[PDB]
Design a protein around this motif. Structure first.
Motif, PDB file in Angstrom:
ATOM      1  N   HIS A 134       0.804  -1.134  -0.131  1.00 20.19           N
ATOM      2  CA  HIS A 134      -0.190   0.148   0.127  1.00 20.19           C
ATOM      3  C   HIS A 134       0.967   1.127  -0.087  1.00 20.19           C
ATOM      4  CE1 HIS A 134       0.503  -0.629   4.376  1.00 20.19           C
ATOM      5  NE2 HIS A 134       0.988   0.501   4.136  1.00 20.19           N
ATOM      6  N   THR A 179       2.259   1.617  11.383  1.00 19.48           N
ATOM      7  CA  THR A 179       2.039   2.949  11.423  1.00 19.48           C
ATOM      8  C   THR A 179       0.605   3.532  11.697  1.00 19.48           C
ATOM      9  OG1 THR A 179       1.916   3.428   9.181  1.00 19.48           O
ATOM     10  CG2 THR A 179       4.106   3.548  10.044  1.00 19.48           C
ATOM     11  N   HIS A 200       1.222   5.782   1.371  1.00 23.94           N
ATOM     12  CA  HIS A 200       0.713   6.612   2.079  1.00 23.94           C
ATOM     13  C   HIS A 200       1.057   8.029   1.359  1.00 23.94           C
ATOM     14  CE1 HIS A 200       0.326   4.427   6.005  1.00 23.94           C
ATOM     15  NE2 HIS A 200       1.130   3.537   5.367  1.00 23.94           N
ATOM     16  N   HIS A 216       4.882   1.017   1.040  1.00 22.51           N
ATOM     17  CA  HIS A 216       4.876  -0.154   2.116  1.00 22.51           C
ATOM     18  C   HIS A 216       4.672  -1.494   1.549  1.00 22.51           C
ATOM     19  CE1 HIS A 216       4.509   2.836   5.365  1.00 22.51           C
ATOM     20  NE2 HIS A 216       5.781   2.936   4.910  1.00 22.51           N
TER      21      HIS A 216
HETATM   22 ZN   LIG Z   1       1.791   1.603   5.689  1.00 18.49          ZN
END
Ligand SMILES: [Zn+2]
Ligand SMILES: Cc1ccc(SCCC(=O)Oc2ccc(S(N)(=O)=O)cc2)cc1
Length: 257
Positions: free
Chosen positions: A91, A196, A93, A116
């Motif tokens: 994924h 996170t 961010h 990630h």
């Molecule tokens: Zn992440």
């Protein structure tokens, strides 16, 4: 329930997830004058099978690409690890503007986004559910994304978002090797840390790439045009999903280089 808005965001996560204030929280600011070169770190080895790619999902705060993880078709090895880690997801961010968006920073510099690639310890544990809460359970590769030239290796991911525009939508997403998204150099930093976002388990060995990858202003716009709302509700664009950097609390960031 938790999110990134003022009421349910990072500053408020500590109310139902007190580990938010723990000693191994991520992400962090990598200060390069404080990293320790570690001679024993081996090269990172990724071997991913494109047939493990399963599904793309709008999860409200983000989107996930999930992999079949029933066997060792898609593994991470080397770096600080004795164990093999099994790929389960990747994924991104991003931030509300090009100025911020990465989770990790390097010498206080904020990039526009971060990739990630998440794995779980299939040497020690029999499932992601068993691995996720264990100190040695999870391995996540982070790649800082620097705004600039369009990144053609994102094309399949970006082309897939029109089918998962609203929260809960999902589609098959197959025949994709995410090692194509990684930078040419796998020179890295590593430190013990956490997820996170909730549930923020301190279960992650972080592998942060030294080399960035590119992303255009318009590719970032595609992420921010994903909708957090369910279909038929008024549109609420996914503007940001980056957690601020958290105190090292005496942890050492090691360098492979
Ligand atoms: Zn992440
Ligand atoms: C309700 C519930 C229970 C357990 C978990 S834990 C397993 C999924 C996971 O590990 O999901 C993440 C992977 C990586 C990252 S990150 N951003 O790379 O740290 C975050 C979540 C999640 C939700």
């Amino acid at each position: 329930d938790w999110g990134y808005d003022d009421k349910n965001g990072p500053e408020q996560w500590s109310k139902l997830y007190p580990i938010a204030n723990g000693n191994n929280q991520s992400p962090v600011d990598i200060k390069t004058s404080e990293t320790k070169h570690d001679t024993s770190l081996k090269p990172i080895s990724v071997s991913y099978n494109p047939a493990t790619a399963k599904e793309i999902i709008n999860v409200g705060h983000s989107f996930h690409v999930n992999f079949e993880d029933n066997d060792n078709r898609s593994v991470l090895k080397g770096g600080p690890f004795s164990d093999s880690y099994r790929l389960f997801q990747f994924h991104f961010h991003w931030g509300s503007t090009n100025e911020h968006g990465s989770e990790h920073t390097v010498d206080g510099v904020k990039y526009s986004a971060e990739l990630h690639v998440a794995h779980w310890n299939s040497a020690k544990y029999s499932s992601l559910a068993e691995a996720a809460s264990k100190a040695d359970g999870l391995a996540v590769i982070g790649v800082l994304m620097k705004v600039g030239e369009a990144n053609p290796k994102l094309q399949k991911v970006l082309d897939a978002l029109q089918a998962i525009k609203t929260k809960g939508k999902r589609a098959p997403f197959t025949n994709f090797d995410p090692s194509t998204l990684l930078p040419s150099s796998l020179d890295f930093w590593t430190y013990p840390g956490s997820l996170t976002h909730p549930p923020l388990y301190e279960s992650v060995t972080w592998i942060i790439c030294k080399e960035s990858i590119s992303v255009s202003s318009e590719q970032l716009a595609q992420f921010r045009s994903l909708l957090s709302n369910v279909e038929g509700d008024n549109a609420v664009p996914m503007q940001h999903n980056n957690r601020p950097t958290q105190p090292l609390k005496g942890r050492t960031v090691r360098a492979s280089f």
